[PDB]
CSV table of C-alpha atoms in Angstrom, one decimal:
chain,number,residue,atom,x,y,z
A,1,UNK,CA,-30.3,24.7,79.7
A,2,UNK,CA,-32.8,24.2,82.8
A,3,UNK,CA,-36.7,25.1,82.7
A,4,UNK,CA,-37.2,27.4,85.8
A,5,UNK,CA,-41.1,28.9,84.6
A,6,UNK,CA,-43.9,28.1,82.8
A,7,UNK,CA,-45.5,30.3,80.9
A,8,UNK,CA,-49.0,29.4,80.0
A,9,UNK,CA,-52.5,30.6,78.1
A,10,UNK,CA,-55.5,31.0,80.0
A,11,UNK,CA,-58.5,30.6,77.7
A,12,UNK,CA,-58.7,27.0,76.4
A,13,UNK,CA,-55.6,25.8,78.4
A,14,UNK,CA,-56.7,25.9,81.4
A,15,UNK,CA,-60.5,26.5,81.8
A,16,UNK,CA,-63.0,24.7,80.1
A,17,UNK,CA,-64.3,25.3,76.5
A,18,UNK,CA,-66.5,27.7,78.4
A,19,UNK,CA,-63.4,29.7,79.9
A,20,UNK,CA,-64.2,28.8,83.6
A,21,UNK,CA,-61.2,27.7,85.3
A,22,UNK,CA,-60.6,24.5,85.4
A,23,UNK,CA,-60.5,22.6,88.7
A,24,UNK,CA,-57.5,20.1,87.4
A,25,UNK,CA,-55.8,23.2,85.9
A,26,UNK,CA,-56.1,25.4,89.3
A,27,UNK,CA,-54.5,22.4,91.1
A,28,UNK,CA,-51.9,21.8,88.9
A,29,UNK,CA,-50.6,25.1,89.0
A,30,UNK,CA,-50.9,25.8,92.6
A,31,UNK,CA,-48.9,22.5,92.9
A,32,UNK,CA,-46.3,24.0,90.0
A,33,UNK,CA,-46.1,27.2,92.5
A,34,UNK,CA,-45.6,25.2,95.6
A,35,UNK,CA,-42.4,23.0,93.6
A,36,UNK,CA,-40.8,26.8,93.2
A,37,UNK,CA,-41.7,26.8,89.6
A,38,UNK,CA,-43.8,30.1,88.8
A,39,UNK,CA,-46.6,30.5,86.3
A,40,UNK,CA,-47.0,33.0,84.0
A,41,UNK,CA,-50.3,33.2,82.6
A,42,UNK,CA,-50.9,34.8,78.8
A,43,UNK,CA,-53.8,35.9,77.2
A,44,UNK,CA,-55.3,37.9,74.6
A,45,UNK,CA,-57.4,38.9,76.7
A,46,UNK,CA,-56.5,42.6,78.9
A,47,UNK,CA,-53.6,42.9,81.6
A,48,UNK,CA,-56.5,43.2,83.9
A,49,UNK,CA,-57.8,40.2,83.7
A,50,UNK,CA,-54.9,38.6,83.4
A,51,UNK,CA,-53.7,40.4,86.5
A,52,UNK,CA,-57.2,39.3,88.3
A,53,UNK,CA,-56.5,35.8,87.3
A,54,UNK,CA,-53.6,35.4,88.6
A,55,UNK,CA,-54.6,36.9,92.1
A,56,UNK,CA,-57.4,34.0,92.0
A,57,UNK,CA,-55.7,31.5,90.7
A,58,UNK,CA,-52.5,31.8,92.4
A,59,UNK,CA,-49.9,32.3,90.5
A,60,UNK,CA,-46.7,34.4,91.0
A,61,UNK,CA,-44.8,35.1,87.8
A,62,UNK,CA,-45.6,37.8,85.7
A,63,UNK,CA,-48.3,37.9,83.3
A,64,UNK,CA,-48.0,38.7,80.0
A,65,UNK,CA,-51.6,40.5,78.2
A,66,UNK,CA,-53.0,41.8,75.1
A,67,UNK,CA,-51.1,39.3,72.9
A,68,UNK,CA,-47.4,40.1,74.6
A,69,UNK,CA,-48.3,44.0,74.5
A,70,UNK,CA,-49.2,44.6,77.9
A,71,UNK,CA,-47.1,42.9,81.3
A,72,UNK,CA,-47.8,43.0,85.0
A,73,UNK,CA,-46.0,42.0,87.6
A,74,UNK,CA,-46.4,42.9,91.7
A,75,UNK,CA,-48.6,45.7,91.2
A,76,UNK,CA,-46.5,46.8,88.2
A,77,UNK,CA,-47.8,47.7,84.7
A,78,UNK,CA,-45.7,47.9,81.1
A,79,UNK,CA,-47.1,48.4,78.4
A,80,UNK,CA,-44.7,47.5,75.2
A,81,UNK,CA,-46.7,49.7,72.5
A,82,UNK,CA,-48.9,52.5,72.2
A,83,UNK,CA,-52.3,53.1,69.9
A,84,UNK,CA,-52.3,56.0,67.2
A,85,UNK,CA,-53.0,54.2,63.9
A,86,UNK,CA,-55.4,51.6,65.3
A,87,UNK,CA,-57.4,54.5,65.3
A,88,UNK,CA,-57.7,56.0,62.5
A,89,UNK,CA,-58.2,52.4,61.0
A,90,UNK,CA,-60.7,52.2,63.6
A,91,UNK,CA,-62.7,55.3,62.1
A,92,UNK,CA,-61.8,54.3,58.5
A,93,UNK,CA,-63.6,51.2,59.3
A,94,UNK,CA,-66.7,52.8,61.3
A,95,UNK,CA,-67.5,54.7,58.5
A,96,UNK,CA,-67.0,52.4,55.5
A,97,UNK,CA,-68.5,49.3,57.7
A,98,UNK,CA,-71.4,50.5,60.5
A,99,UNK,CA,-72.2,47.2,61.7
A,100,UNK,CA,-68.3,46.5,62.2
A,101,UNK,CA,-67.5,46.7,65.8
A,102,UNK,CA,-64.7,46.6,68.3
A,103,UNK,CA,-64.2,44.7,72.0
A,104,UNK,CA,-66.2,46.3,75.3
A,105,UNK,CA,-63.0,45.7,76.8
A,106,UNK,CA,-61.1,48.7,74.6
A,107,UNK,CA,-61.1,51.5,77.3
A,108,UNK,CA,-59.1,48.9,79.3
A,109,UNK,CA,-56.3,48.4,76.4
A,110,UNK,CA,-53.2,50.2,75.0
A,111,UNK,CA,-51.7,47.9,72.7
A,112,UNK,CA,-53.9,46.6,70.1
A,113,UNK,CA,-57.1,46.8,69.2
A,114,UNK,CA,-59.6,44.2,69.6
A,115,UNK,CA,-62.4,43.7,66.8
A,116,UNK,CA,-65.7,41.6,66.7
A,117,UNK,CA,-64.9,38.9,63.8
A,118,UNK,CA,-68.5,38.5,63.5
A,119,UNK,CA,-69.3,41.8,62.6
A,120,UNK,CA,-66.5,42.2,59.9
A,121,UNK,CA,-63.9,39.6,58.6
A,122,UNK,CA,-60.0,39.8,58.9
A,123,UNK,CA,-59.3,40.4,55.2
A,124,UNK,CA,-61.6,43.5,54.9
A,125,UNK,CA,-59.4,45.0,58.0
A,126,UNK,CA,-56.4,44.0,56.2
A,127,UNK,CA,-57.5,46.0,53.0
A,128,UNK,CA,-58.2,48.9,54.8
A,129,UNK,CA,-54.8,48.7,56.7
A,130,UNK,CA,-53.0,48.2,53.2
A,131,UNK,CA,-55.2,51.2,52.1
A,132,UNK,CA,-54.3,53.3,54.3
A,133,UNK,CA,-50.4,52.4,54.3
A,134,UNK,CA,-50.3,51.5,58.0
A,135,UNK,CA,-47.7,49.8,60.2
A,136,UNK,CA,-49.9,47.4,61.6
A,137,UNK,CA,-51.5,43.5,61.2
A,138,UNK,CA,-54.2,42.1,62.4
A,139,UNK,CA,-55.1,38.3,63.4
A,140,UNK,CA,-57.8,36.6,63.6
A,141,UNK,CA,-57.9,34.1,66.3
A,142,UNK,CA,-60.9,32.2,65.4
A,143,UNK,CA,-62.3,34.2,68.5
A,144,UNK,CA,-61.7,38.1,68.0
A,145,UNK,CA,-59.5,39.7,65.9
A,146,UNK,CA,-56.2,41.8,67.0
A,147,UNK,CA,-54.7,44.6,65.7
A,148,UNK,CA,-51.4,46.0,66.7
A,149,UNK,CA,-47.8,46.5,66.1
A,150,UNK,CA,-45.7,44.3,63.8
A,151,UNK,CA,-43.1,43.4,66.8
A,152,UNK,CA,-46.1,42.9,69.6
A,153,UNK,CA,-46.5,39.1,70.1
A,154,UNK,CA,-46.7,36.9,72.8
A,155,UNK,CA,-42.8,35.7,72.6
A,156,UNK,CA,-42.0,39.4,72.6
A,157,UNK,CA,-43.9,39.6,75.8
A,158,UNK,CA,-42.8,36.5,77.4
A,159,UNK,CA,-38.9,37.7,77.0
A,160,UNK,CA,-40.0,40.9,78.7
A,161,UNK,CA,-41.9,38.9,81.2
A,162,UNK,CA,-38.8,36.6,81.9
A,163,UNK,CA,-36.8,39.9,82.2
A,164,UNK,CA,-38.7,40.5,85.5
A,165,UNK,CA,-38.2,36.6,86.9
A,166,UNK,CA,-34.6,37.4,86.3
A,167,UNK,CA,-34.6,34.2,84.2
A,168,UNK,CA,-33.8,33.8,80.3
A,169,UNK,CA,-36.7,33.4,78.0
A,170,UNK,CA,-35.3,29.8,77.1
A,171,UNK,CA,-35.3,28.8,80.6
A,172,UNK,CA,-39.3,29.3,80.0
A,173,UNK,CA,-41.4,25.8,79.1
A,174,UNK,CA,-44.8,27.4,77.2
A,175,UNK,CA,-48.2,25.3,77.1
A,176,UNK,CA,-50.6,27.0,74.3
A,177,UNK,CA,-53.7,26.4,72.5
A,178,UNK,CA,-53.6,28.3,69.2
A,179,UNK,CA,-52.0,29.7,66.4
A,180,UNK,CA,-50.8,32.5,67.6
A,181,UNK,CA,-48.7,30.5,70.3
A,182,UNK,CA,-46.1,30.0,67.8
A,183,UNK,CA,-44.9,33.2,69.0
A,184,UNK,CA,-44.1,32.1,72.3
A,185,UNK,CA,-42.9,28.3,71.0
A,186,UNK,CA,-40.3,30.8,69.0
A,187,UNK,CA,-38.7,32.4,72.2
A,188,UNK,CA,-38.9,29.5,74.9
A,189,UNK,CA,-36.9,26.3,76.1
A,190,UNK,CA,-39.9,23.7,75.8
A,191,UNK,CA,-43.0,23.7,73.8
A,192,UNK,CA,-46.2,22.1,74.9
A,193,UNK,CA,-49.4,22.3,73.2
A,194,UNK,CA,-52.6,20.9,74.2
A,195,UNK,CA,-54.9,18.3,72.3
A,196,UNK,CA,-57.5,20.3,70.8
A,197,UNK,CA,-54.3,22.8,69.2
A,198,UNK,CA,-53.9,23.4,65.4
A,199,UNK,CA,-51.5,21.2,63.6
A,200,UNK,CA,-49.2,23.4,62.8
A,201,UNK,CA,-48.3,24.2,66.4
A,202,UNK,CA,-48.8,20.5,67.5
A,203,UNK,CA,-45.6,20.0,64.7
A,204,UNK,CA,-44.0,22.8,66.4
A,205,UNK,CA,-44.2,20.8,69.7
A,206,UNK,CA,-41.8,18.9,72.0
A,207,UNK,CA,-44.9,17.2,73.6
A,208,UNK,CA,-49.1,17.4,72.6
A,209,UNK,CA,-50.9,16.0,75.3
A,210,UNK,CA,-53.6,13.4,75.3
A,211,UNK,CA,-56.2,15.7,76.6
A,212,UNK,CA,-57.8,19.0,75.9
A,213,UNK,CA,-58.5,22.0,77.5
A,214,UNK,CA,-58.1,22.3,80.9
A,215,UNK,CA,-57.1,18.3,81.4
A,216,UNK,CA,-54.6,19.1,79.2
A,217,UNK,CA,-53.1,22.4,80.6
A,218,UNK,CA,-53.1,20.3,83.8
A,219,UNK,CA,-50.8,17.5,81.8
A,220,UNK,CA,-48.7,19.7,80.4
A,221,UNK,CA,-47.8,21.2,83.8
A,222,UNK,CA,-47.2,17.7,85.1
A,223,UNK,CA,-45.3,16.5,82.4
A,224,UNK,CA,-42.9,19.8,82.1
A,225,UNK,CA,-42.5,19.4,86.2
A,226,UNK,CA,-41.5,15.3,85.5
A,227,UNK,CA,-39.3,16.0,82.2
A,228,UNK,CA,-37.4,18.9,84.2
A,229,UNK,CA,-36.3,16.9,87.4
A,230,UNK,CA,-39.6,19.1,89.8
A,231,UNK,CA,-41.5,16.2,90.1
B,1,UNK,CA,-89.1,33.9,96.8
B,2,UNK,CA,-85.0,34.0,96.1
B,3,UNK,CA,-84.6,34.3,92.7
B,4,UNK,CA,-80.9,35.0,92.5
B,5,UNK,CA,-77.9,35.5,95.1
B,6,UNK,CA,-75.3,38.4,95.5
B,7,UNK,CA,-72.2,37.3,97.0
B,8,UNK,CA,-68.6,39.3,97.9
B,9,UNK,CA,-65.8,38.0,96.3
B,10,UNK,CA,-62.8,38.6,98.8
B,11,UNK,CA,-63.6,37.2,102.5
B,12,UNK,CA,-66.4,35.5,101.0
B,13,UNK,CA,-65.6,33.0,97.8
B,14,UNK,CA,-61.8,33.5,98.5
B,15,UNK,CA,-58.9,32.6,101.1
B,16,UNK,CA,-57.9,35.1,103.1
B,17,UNK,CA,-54.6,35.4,100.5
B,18,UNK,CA,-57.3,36.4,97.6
B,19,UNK,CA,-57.2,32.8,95.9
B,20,UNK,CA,-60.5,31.7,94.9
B,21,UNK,CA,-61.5,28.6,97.0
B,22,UNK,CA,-63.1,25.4,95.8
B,23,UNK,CA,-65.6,25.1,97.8
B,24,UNK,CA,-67.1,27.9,97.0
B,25,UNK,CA,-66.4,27.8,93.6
B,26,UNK,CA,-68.4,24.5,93.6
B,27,UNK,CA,-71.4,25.8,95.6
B,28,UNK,CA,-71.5,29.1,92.8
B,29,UNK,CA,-71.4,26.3,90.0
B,30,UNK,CA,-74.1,24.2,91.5
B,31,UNK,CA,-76.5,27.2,92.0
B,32,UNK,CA,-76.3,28.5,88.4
B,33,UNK,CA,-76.4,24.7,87.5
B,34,UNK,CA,-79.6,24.7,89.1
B,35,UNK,CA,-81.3,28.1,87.7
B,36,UNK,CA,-80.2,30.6,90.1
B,37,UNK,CA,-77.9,33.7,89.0
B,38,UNK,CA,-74.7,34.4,91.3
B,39,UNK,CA,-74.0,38.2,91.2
B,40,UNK,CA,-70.8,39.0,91.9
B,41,UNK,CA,-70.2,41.8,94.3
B,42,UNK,CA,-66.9,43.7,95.0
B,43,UNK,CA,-65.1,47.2,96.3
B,44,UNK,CA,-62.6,46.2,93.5
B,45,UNK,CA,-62.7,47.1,89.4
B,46,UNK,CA,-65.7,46.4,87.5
B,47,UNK,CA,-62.1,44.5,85.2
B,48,UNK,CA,-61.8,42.6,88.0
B,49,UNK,CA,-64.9,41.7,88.7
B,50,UNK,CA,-65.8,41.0,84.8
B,51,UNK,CA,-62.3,38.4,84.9
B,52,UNK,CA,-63.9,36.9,88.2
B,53,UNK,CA,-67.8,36.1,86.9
B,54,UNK,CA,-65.9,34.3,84.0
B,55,UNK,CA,-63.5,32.4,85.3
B,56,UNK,CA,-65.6,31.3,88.0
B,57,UNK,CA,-68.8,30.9,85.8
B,58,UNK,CA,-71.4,33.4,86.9
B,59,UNK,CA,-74.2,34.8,84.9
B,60,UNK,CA,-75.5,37.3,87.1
B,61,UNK,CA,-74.9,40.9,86.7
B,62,UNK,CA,-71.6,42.0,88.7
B,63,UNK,CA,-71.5,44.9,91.1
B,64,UNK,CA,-68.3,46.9,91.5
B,65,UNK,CA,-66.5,50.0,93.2
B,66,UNK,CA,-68.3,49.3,95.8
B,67,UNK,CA,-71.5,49.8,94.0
B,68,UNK,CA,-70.1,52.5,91.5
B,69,UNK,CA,-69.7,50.1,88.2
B,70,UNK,CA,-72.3,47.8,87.2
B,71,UNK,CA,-71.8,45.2,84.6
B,72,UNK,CA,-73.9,42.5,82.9
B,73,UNK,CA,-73.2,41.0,78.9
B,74,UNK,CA,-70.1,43.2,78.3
B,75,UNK,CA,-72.5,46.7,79.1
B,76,UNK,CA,-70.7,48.2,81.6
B,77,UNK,CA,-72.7,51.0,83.6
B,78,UNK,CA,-70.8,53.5,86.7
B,79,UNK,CA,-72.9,55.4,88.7
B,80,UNK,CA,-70.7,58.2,89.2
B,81,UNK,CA,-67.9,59.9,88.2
B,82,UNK,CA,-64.4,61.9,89.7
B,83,UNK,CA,-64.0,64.8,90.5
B,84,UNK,CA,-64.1,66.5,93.9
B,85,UNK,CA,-61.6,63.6,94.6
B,86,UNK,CA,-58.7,64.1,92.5
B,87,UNK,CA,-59.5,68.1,94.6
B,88,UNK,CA,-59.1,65.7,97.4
B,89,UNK,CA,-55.6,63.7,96.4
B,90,UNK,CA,-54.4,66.9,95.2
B,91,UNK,CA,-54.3,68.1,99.4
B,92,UNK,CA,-53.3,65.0,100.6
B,93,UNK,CA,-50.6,64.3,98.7
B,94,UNK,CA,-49.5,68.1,99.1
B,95,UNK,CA,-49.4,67.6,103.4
B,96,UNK,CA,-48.8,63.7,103.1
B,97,UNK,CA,-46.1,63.6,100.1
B,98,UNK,CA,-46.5,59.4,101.4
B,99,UNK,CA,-49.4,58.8,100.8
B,100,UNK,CA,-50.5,56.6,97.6
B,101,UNK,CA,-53.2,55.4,95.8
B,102,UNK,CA,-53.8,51.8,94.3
B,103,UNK,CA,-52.3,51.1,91.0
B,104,UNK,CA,-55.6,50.2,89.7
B,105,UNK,CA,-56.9,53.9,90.0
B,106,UNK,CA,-56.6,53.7,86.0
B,107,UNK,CA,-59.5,51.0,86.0
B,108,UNK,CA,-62.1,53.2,88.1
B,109,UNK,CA,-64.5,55.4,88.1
B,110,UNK,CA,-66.5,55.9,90.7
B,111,UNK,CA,-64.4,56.0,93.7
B,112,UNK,CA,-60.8,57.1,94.4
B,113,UNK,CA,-58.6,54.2,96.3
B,114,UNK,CA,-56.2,55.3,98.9
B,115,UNK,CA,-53.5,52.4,100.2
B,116,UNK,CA,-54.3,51.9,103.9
B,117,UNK,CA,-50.5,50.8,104.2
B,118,UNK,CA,-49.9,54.9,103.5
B,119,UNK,CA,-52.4,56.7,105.6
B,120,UNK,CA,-55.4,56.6,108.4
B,121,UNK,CA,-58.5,56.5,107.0
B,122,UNK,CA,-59.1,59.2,109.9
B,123,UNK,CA,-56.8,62.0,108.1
B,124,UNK,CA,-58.9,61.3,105.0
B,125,UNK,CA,-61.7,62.2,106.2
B,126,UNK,CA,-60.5,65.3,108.3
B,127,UNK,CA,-58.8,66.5,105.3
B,128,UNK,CA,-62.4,65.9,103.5
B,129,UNK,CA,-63.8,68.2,106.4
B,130,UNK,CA,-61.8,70.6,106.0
B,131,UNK,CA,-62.6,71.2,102.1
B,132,UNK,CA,-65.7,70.4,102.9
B,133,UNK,CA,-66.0,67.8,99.7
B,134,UNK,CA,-69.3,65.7,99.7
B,135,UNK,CA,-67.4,62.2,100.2
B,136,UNK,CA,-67.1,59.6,102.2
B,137,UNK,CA,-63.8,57.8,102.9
B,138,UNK,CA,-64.5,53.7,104.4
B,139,UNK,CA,-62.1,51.4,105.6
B,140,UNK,CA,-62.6,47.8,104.1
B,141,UNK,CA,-59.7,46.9,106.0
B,142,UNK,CA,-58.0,46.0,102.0
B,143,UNK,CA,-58.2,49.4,101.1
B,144,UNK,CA,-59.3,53.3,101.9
B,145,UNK,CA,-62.4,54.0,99.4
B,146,UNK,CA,-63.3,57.7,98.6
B,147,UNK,CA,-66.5,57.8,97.1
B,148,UNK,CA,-69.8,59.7,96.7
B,149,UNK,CA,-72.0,59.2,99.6
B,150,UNK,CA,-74.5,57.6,98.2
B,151,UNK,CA,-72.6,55.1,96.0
B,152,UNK,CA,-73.0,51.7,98.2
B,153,UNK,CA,-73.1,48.1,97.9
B,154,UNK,CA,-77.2,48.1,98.3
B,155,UNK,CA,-77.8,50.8,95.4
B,156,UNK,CA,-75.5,49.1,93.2
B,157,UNK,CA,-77.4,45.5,94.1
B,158,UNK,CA,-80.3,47.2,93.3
B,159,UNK,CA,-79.7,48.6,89.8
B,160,UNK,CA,-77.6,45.3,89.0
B,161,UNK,CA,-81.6,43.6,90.0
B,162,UNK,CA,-83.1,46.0,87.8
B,163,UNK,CA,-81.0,44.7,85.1
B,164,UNK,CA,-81.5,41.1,85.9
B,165,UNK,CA,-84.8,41.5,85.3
B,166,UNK,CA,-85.7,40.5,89.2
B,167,UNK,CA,-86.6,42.6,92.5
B,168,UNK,CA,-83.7,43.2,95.0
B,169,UNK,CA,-86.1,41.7,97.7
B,170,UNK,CA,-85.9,38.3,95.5
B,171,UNK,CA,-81.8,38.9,96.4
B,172,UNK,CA,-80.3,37.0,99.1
B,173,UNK,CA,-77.2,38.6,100.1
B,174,UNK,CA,-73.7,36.8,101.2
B,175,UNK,CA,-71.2,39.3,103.1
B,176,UNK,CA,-68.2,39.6,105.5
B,177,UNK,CA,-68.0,43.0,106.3
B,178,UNK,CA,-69.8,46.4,107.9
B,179,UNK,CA,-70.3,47.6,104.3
B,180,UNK,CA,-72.3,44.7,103.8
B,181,UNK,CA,-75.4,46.5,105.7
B,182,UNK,CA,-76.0,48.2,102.6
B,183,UNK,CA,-76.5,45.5,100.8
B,184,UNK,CA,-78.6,43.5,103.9
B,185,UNK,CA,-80.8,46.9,103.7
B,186,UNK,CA,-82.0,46.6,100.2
B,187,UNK,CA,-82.2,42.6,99.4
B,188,UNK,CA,-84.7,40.2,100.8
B,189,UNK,CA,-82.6,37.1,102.3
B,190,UNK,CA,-79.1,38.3,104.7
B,191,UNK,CA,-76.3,35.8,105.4
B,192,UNK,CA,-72.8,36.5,107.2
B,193,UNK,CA,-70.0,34.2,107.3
B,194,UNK,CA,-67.8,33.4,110.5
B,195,UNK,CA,-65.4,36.0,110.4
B,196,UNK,CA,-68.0,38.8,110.1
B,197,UNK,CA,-68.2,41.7,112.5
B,198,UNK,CA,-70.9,41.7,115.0
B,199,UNK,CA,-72.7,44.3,113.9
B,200,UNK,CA,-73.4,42.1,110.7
B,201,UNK,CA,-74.0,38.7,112.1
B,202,UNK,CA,-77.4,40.5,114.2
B,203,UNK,CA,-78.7,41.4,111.1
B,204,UNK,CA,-78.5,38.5,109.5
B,205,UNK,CA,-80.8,35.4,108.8
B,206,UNK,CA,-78.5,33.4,109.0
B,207,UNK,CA,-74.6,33.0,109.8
B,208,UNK,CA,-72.7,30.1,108.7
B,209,UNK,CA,-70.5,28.3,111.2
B,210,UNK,CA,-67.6,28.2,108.9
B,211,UNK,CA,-65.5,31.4,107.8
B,212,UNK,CA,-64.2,33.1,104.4
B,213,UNK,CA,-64.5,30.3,101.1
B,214,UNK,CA,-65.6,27.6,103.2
B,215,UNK,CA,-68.3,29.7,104.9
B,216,UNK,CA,-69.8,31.1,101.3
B,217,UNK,CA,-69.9,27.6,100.1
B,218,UNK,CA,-72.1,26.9,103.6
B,219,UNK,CA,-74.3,29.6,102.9
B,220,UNK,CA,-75.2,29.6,98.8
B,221,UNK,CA,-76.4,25.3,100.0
B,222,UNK,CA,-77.8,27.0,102.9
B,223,UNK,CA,-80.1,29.2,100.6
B,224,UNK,CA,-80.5,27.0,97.8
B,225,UNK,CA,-82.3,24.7,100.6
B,226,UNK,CA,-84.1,27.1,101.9
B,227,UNK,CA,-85.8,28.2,99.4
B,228,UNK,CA,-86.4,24.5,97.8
B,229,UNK,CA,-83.7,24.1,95.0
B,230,UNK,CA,-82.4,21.0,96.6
């Protein structure tokens, strides 16, 4: 079929290895928007960042949060899971391991719980999950470490996302970073990532761009917009 | 001596459609580039306000809720909480059934947010009159803000100083808006771009010539000149 979005990570995709926005990436996008081609930005990170991002960056498709668990979209939140177990792995944890610690940004989520990976490794909250017999899994992005629902994911959330657009999910080009992106790869049209990626999702790939970061969020854009007929 | 500057995000470092402008995200690089902390002020969440210090780079401590939430290496700090105001939204939305709040109420803490789109920020505060509730309903022109009344842009500067480690008079203060007094009151250096009212350009010490993104870009170079970090 025909790409009519781009869905898209924010940290490492488009900001710099700090996670500023990148001025290349910023453009690149608001020039995506002006072509008729929305953006929707997905992060790890909560839906009101993401939500805050996309007000300041500029972009008008929905965004997809919390690792596909949380969307917003014109003032609208959905949230695609609810937290019961995370807690009581959560107090299972606090009392076994009392340096272990989770996110400061946790009041602000509903759909997975966000852990310190330097304060306690994956496998050890693995154990405990196995332990306990609970329904969930936890990642480890090389940054923080998720736990939520076996069906939460980013693709899960773009599909959802794409429900709002009105579009199908493989009408959907995605540009990630990491690991984790194969999710999205799994449910879209086109599959970009950039060149600082893993290999296993550069294999999974249609295109890997010359440059990382930012430079390369703002590559993929263009090259998605020139491949599609936009540009 | 200006050791660091406070600076609102919409009107100021934004186009008037919200969008964070280049200019001005330049000028707030350049002065933390150059040793001098950018703290973010804002009548939106302390979320928001958190999501704009890092995609924008600031290291400064970031004021929200009008000065309600504080925030400053992931410690986040409100200065109030709710209460007489859900009393309050309980009347009005029993006389004005349409009537709504912002969908970012979930967010806050310190200050209940009523759309201006719905209703006058007069019947607000005549139905806070009539309760007699100790709060203070503003206009930002954005949005209705119902808050304690001494929650403010210049208390929450201050604290956010406290944190930083620096006196508020070592502030200098970049604002658009009446609110903004506050915040002249309390630091030691006032700016007001263009499009400012009147009553906040004679109070500053300077307005720029240019308005909104543009305008806060003028004033962090004019500062950082000022005060020799040229």
């Amino acid at each position: 079929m025909k790409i009519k979005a781009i869905s898209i990570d924010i940290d490492g995709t488009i900001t710099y290895p700090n996670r500023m926005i990148h001025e290349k990436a910023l453009e690149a996008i608001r020039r995506a928007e002006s072509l008729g081609i929305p953006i929707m930005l997905v992060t790890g990170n909560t839906v009101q960042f993401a939500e805050a991002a996309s007000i300041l960056i500029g972009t008008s498709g929905p965004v997809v949060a919390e690792d596909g668990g949380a969307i917003s979209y014109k003032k609208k939140r959905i949230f695609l899971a609810s937290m019961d177990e995370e807690w009581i792995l959560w107090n299972e944890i606090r009392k076994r391991f009392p340096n272990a610690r989770t996110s400061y940004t946790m009041p602000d989520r509903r759909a997975g719980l966000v852990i310190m990976r330097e304060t306690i490794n994956v496998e050890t909250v693995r154990e405990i999950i196995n332990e306990l017999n609970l329904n969930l899994v936890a990642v480890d992005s090389g940054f923080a470490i998720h736990v939520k629902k076996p069906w939460i994911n980013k693709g899960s959330g773009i599909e959802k996302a794409s429900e709002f657009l009105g579009i199908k999910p493989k009408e959907v080009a995605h540009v990630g970073d990491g690991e984790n992106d194969l999710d999205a790869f799994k449910v879209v049209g086109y599959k970009v990532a950039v060149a600082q990626a893993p290999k296993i999702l550069k294999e999974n790939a249609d295109y890997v761009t010359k440059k990382e970061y930012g430079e390369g969020g703002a590559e993929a854009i263009y090259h998605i917009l020139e491949k599609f007929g936009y540009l």
